[PDB]
Ligand binder design. Structure first.
Ligand SMILES: Nc1nc2c(ncn2[C@@H]2O[C@H](COP(=O)(O)OP(=O)(O)OP(=O)(O)O)[C@@H](O)[C@H]2O)c(=O)[nH]1
Ligand SMILES: Nc1ncnc2c1ncn2[C@@H]1O[C@H](COP(=O)(O)OP(=O)(O)CP(=O)(O)O)[C@@H](O)[C@H]1O
Ligand SMILES: Nc1nc2c(ncn2[C@@H]2O[C@H](COP(=O)(O)OP(=O)(O)O)[C@@H](O)[C@H]2O)c(=O)[nH]1
Ligand SMILES: [Ca+2]
Ligand SMILES: [Mg+2]
Ligand SMILES: [Mg+2]
Ligand SMILES: [Mg+2]
Lengths: 5, 54, 439, 428, 344
């Protein structure tokens, strides 16, 4: 699971 | 019914109305408790700081 | 003339104190400057209002009052209050770290560090009294300071002023405006410790005054300001005899005499009428017999209970304003019939009456309408015991699991003191029971 | 009980810490340079709680930024409010913690901890009356988790009578694929049961599910997850930041929320749920704020409150609304779902109403529940933990830094006790 | 949705009402000690009225009137009927009585003056002994049972036996009528149209007095102490419809005129008297309560009040109709959802 502001 | 003790004045009056008749601890002693809690509390804080020292 | 020093403790005590001394000033015609045009005894006097006010050469009338709060925010508002010139700095005492709704914290921890400063500031007033008759203590049951530090102070005053009188104005806790879960703890705790040091105590359930404010003043969400101005009207009725010239309840000793046969059972139920909305331009002028009858309707009581299923030991009627004895004694004759008033078999089944010709003053711009006549009944009925029962059940529920107890133990208090205070209360409910029910 | 000292440790800690300051700064009308430009005066009444004052009456956050690598803090310093923070209150190393609790708590972090406590001490002396500290951090990494708990243990030693508060981000495989996070989290929990008075359990499993299911974001970002945290943090501290009557300081909150010293892990909820893209043109009704704030969908902890019982509840409503109607709906939930509230704590639900609403909303409701259902969270971590520990997997990363298997067993054991303790009172 | 609790499970009546409440799908039942309830089916005794009406935002109702014990307990009722002006000592419908505390406010014994007032008497006189427990003796000579009272520790009361009761034929049988009365929170006095005759099984003879069971008409005595049951009426429970028909074909009258008017009168008199003492019109909580009045009729068709049952049981036949009726009038009037009574 890829999650950057 | 009986009215009694009619006390009057310029600022008010009062009376009684009957319908039927009948049918310490010391100063130091206080402080002994205030310090008995300061110690109990200082102890529980010593045990924490003791636990934290570990 | 015998002086009375008023002691306001905690948030509740100080805020109610303001409602009172504000009302006092309106009734005695004292300005926000402390100046009194009506008064001519400049510098000093033997008047009856001098029992609550001292006098200065400049002509200022200064409340014989001390304010205390472990938190500075509340008392700070007095300092910049609309009535700020009245009080001088030495009267307003403030800490910085409050008691966080913890009795133990207010009694033991924070309490020890300020008890000797407050007694010092009280002593400075006692040394301005020619014949001090006693103290009037204002506080809450639920607060940390109100419950904790109060019980500490009462213990000291029974030593420093052993033969002087001490009367209590106490706010009983109601969930509808309470701000803590542990208020039932702080309540039982402070009562047990204070019981032997209080001669007469007037309980006020926030619940009652809240509903009264809802019902009779048409207020949706009553603020404390709403709750307080109502309380002051009550308190005024109790103290008017000390501040004005009268023959009933003329000094603090008479309160214990008239209302308190059993020293432990010293919690008279207060009932007051008429409470009228000010928004109502026209309000029906309730007659003497009408407001006298209202004294027995629970909806007007300072504590919601049922006097019908209790017995009386005393009963006072304090009328203020346009009232004459003929209308009074008439209404008394009536009520004995319609209403269930049983006295104890060792008391005369009667009423002590008093009238104060000056009528109930109201704060300009308030929620209470000025009325021509009003009454405040002080009945020492056993029905008030219902309030102790309520409070004690909530106590036992939480304590069975020792919930929140660690907060108290952590302040150096002992878990045994909880048991000590609860078993003391269990005796009070028994005493109330032995006096007012058929075996 | 006046000033609070804020600390943020690690990547997660500094990101949510920064976002938290971004939000409340806007609410208190403080601009990035630190000058005040707001309408209402309610904004400046209790400003001293989180901010210090300086020359030119500039407002500086009472915040200490901690990390073992310069990455996130360089980004924060070049962030939006970057220049607001006290430059000296940036305390960072270079080695990094490598998502290792041991590195953060015993070796790499021990090498830096003293320097941080110097900044803590300097801020604590500026205080007229210190309440305590709030820490923001994740439990899944190394710095925030390991070094964070170390700082707590050390701070409790210098300030044992102060209150220790934490916003702790719990790990979830739905958000991170790092295998050792359950080790880090279990070790941290042990520390938190012992050395904090209040801990807000911010669960990344919840934040993700909220973002994906409710807010319909197919690829949730950290910014999306943090928008929720930021909203929660604002609401939870509202009673602290503006004039109020209930839970107005950390100790009073703790006394109301914590019936037992170890059970201080709160379940935060919020409504209306919002995304940075969501419009929110239609303000919610008071009944709607209430039904949602108690709804599991709005819980930030990913626990089903119907599986446990509420020991205590704090509810905070924001915005101009009928305070009358608030009481009725609050009393309605209690009386409707009375079975889910423990009977042996009468009136365990307390409510406050602040007039100033959060940024972008007219009506908002925040939830703080000490539910026994929080155990489901600790149960989740415990299983992920044992799955590896029964085979002693990945332990060499930790033993290499000086730790021993026994220290794991004790942390595992203590958190199993916590779960059982939460269960003891659920059947009461 | 509504919430209620139960604290008396040994009650036959409210076990049924509790059953019917749950059948509406609008009444959830709580644990017996949950404070956040709307209704309370409280306990017969020790009911804590002091805790009701103090829960914010909860309208609270209960199935008992505080202070109602003054009318239901034996010694209290008597003291009430003579001390209360609304019911003169010279009460037409209540038999002569005097309160009796053992040797251990003793009215003991201005009562004896009444006996020697019947030493001049040719009007026979016999006085009973009944009191608290279910476990009662009857004879002319007073001193006999005065020992029986001084024996046990309970408090008692003595009252003239009705020597000429109405006798049902065939059988020459004694009986008494049980009427059920419901009072709501508005103090509307409702009478259940259906009543029952607790008839005696055997003929009534004034010969023998000791455990003679033809004197007493209790369900417990008639079933246990007699080989006589169901001969004339099943259950010894003759309902009003039959008693009505009998009185016409026998004495040429109706239940309505001969008996019911007098019944309906005593009900009003008793409850209106205690009304200001127990009413919840202005209280922080509200009350309602089911009562069971026991009446005796004599050969002159004059009705007498025996006692008032505070915790009455119902006839098996009338449960479904009455317990349903209680919900309509007492509970649903206060707690609305989404006649078999007679107002007085
Ligand atoms: N009637 C009335 N009740 C009040 C008022 N202020 C507080 N209370 C009640 O008092 C209880 C809390 O006690 P407080 O007086 O606020 O606390 P405290 O004495 O300042 O002690 P601390 O714990 O240190 O704050 C609650 O049950 C409130 O409902 C007030 O101004 N008027
Ligand atoms: N003055 C009187 N005249 C005739 N019968 C009388 C009487 N006083 C009492 N009794 C008798 O008392 C008998 C039983 O009545 P009781 O007072 O026991 O009521 P009850 O059993 O239905 C309720 P409980 O006994 O539990 O209090 C009646 O059948 C009646 O015959
Ligand atoms: N919500 C949120 N979680 C984060 C963020 N950064 C890291 N995390 C979580 O924190 C854990 C990793 O800890 P991290 O803070 O990166 O390591 P640290 O620098 O050693 O403290 C993982 O479970 C991540 O999901 C962030 O910005 N927001
Ligand atoms: Ca003067
Ligand atoms: Mg306070
Ligand atoms: Mg990283
Ligand atoms: Mg190194």
């Amino acid at each position: 699971x890829v999650x950057x502001x | 019914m009986e009215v009694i003790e009619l006390n009057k004045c310029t600022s008010g009056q009062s009376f009684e109305v009957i319908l039927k008749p009948p049918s310490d601890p010391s100063l130091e002693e206080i402080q002994k408790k205030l310090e008995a809690a300061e110690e109990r509390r200082k102890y529980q804080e010593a045990e924490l700081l003791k636990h934290l020292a570990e | 003339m015998r002086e009375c020093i008023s002691i306001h403790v905690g948030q509740a005590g100080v805020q109610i104190g303001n409602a009172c001394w504000e009302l006092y000033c309106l009734e005695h015609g004292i300005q926000p400057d402390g100046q009194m045009p009506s008064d001519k005894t400049i510098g000093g006097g033997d008047d009856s209002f001098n029992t609550f006010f001292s006098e200065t050469g400049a002509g200022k009338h200064v409340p014989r009052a001390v304010f205390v709060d472990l938190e500075p925010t509340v008392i700070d508002e007095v300092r910049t209050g609309t009535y700020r010139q009245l009080f001088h700095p030495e009267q307003l005492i403030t800490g910085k770290e409050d008691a966080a709704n913890n009795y133990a914290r207010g009694h033991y921890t924070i309490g020890k560090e300020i008890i000797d400063l407050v007694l010092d500031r009280i002593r400075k007033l006692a040394d301005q009294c020619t014949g001090l008759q006693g103290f009037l203590v204002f506080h809450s049951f639920g607060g940390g300071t109100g419950s904790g530090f109060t019980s500490l102070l009462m213990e000291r005053l029974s030593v420093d002023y052993g033969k002087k009188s001490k009367l209590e104005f106490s706010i009983y806790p109601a969930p509808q405006v309470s701000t803590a879960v542990v208020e039932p703890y702080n309540s039982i705790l402070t009562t047990h410790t204070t019981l032997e040091h209080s001669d007469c105590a007037f309980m006020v359930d926030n619940e009652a005054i809240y509903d009264i404010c809802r019902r009779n003043l048409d207020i949706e969400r009553p603020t404390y300001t709403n709750l307080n101005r109502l309380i002051s009207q009550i308190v005024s009725s109790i103290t008017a005899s000390l501040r004005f010239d009268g023959a009933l309840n003329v000094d603090l000793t008479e309160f214990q005499t008239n209302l308190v046969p059993y020293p432990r059972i010293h919690f008279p139920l207060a009932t007051y009428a008429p409470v009228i909305s000010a928004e109502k331009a026209y309000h029906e002028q309730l007659s003497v017999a009408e407001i006298t009858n209202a004294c027995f309707e629970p909806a007007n009581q300072m504590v919601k209970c049922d006097p019908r299923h209790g017995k009386y030991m005393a009963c006072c009627l304090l009328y203020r304003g346009d009232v004459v004895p003929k209308d009074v004694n008439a209404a008394i004759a009536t009520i004995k019939t319609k209403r269930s008033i049983q006295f104890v078999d060792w008391c005369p089944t009667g009423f002590k009456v008093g009238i104060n010709y000056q009528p109930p003053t109201v704060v300009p711009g308030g929620d209470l309408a000025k009325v021509q006549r009003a009454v405040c009944m002080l009945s020492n009925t056993t029905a008030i015991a219902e309030a102790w029962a309520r409070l004690d059940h909530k106590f036992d529920l939480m304590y069975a699991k020792r919930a929140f107890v660690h907060w108290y133990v952590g302040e150096g208090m002992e878990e045994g003191e909880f048991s000590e205070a609860r078993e003391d209360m269990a005796a009070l409910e028994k005493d109330y029971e032995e006096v007012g029910v058929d075996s | 009980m006046r000033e609070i000292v804020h600390i943020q440790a690690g990547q997660c800690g500094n990101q949510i810490g920064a976002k938290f300051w971004e939000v409340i700064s806007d609410e208190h009308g403080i601009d990035p340079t630190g000058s005040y430009h707001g309408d209402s005066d309610l904004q400046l009444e209790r400003i001293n709680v989180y901010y210090n004052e300086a020359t030119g009456n500039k407002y500086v956050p009472r915040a200490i930024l901690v990390d073992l690598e310069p990455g996130t803090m360089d980004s924060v310093r070049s962030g939006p409010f970057g220049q607001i923070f006290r430059p000296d209150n940036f305390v960072f190393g270079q080695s990094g913690a490598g998502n290792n609790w041991a590195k953060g708590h015993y070796t790499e972090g021990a090498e830096l901890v003293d320097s941080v406590l110097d900044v803590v001490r300097k801020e604590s002396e500026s205080c007229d009356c210190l309440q305590g500290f709030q820490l923001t951090h994740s439990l899944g990494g190394g710095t925030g988790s390991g070094m964070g708990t170390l700082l707590i243990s050390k701070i409790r030693e210098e300030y044992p009578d102060r209150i220790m508060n934490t916003f702790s981000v719990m790990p979830s495989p739905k958000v991170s694929d790092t295998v050792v996070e359950p080790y880090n989290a279990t070790l941290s929990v042990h520390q938190l049961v012992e050395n904090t008075d209040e801990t807000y359990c911010i669960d990344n499993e919840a934040l993700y599910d909220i973002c994906f299911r409710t807010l319909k974001l197919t690829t949730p970002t950290y910014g999306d997850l943090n928008h929720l945290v930021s909203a929660t943090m604002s609401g939870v501290t509202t009673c602290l930041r503006f004039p109020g009557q209930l839970n107005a300081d950390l100790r009073k909150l703790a006394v109301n929320m914590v019936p037992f010293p170890r059970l201080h892990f709160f379940m935060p909820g919020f409504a209306p749920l919002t995304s940075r893209g969501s419009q929110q043109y239609r303000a919610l009704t008071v009944p709607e704020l209430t039904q949602q704030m108690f709804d599991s969908k709005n819980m930030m902890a990913a626990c089903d409150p119907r599986h446990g019982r509420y020991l205590t509840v704090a509810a905070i409503f924001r915005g101009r609304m009928s305070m009358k109607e608030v009481d009725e709906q609050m009393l309605n939930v209690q009386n409707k779902n009375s079975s889910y509230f423990v009977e042996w704590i009468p009136n365990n639900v307390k409510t406050a109403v602040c007039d100033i609403p959060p940024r972008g909303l007219k009506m908002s409701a925040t939830f703080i529940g000490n539910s026994t259902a929080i155990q489901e969270l600790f149960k989740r971590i415990s299983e992920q933990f044992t799955a590896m520990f029964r085979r002693k997997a990945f332990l060499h990363w930790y033993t290499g830094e000086g730790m021993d298997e026994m220290e794991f067993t004790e942390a595992e054991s203590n958190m199993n006790d916590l779960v059982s303790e939460y269960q003891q009172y659920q059947d009461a | 949705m509504y919430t209620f609790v139960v604290r008396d499970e040994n009650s036959s009546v409210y076990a049924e009402v509790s059953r019917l409440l749950l059948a509406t799908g609008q009444w959830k039942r709580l644990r017996k000690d949950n404070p956040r309830f709307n209704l309370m089916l409280g306990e017969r005794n020790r009911l804590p009225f002091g805790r009701l009406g103090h829960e914010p935002g909860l309208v609270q109702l209960v199935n008992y009137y505080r202070g109602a014990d003054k009318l239901c307990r034996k010694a209290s009722l008597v003291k009430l009927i003579k001390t209360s002006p609304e019911l003169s000592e010279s009460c037409t419908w209540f038999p002569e009585s005097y309160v009796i505390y053992p040797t251990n406010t003793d009215e003991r014994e201005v009562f004896l003056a009444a006996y020697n007032r019947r030493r001049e008497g040719r009007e026979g006189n016999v006085w009973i002994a009944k009191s608290s427990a279910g476990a009662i003796l009857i004879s002319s000579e007073a001193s006999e049972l005065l020992d029986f009272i001084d024996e046990q520790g309970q408090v008692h009361v003595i009252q003239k036996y009705l020597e000429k009761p109405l006798l049902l034929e065939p059988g020459h049988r004694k009986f008494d009528i049980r009427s059920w009365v419901l009072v709501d929170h508005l103090y509307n006095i409702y009478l259940y149209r259906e009543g029952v005759l607790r008839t005696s099984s055997e003929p009534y003879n004034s010969a023998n007095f000791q455990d003679k069971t033809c004197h007493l008409t209790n369900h417990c005595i008639q079933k246990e102490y007699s080989k006589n049951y169901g001969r004339y009426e099943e259950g010894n429970e003759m309902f009003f419809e039959e008693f009505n028909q009998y009185l016409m074909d026998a004495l040429n009258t109706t239940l309505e005129n001969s008996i019911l008017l007098q019944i309906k009168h005593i009900i009003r008199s008793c409850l209106m008297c205690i009304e200001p003492a127990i009413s919840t019109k202005h209280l922080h909580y509200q009350s309602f309560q089911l009562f069971g009045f026991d009446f005796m009729v004599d050969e002159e068709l004059k009705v007498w009040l025996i006692e008032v049952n505070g915790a009455p049981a119902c006839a098996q036949k009338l449960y479904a109709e009455l317990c349903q009726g209680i919900v309509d009038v007492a509970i649903s009037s206060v707690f609305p959802l989404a006649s078999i009574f007679i107002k007085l």
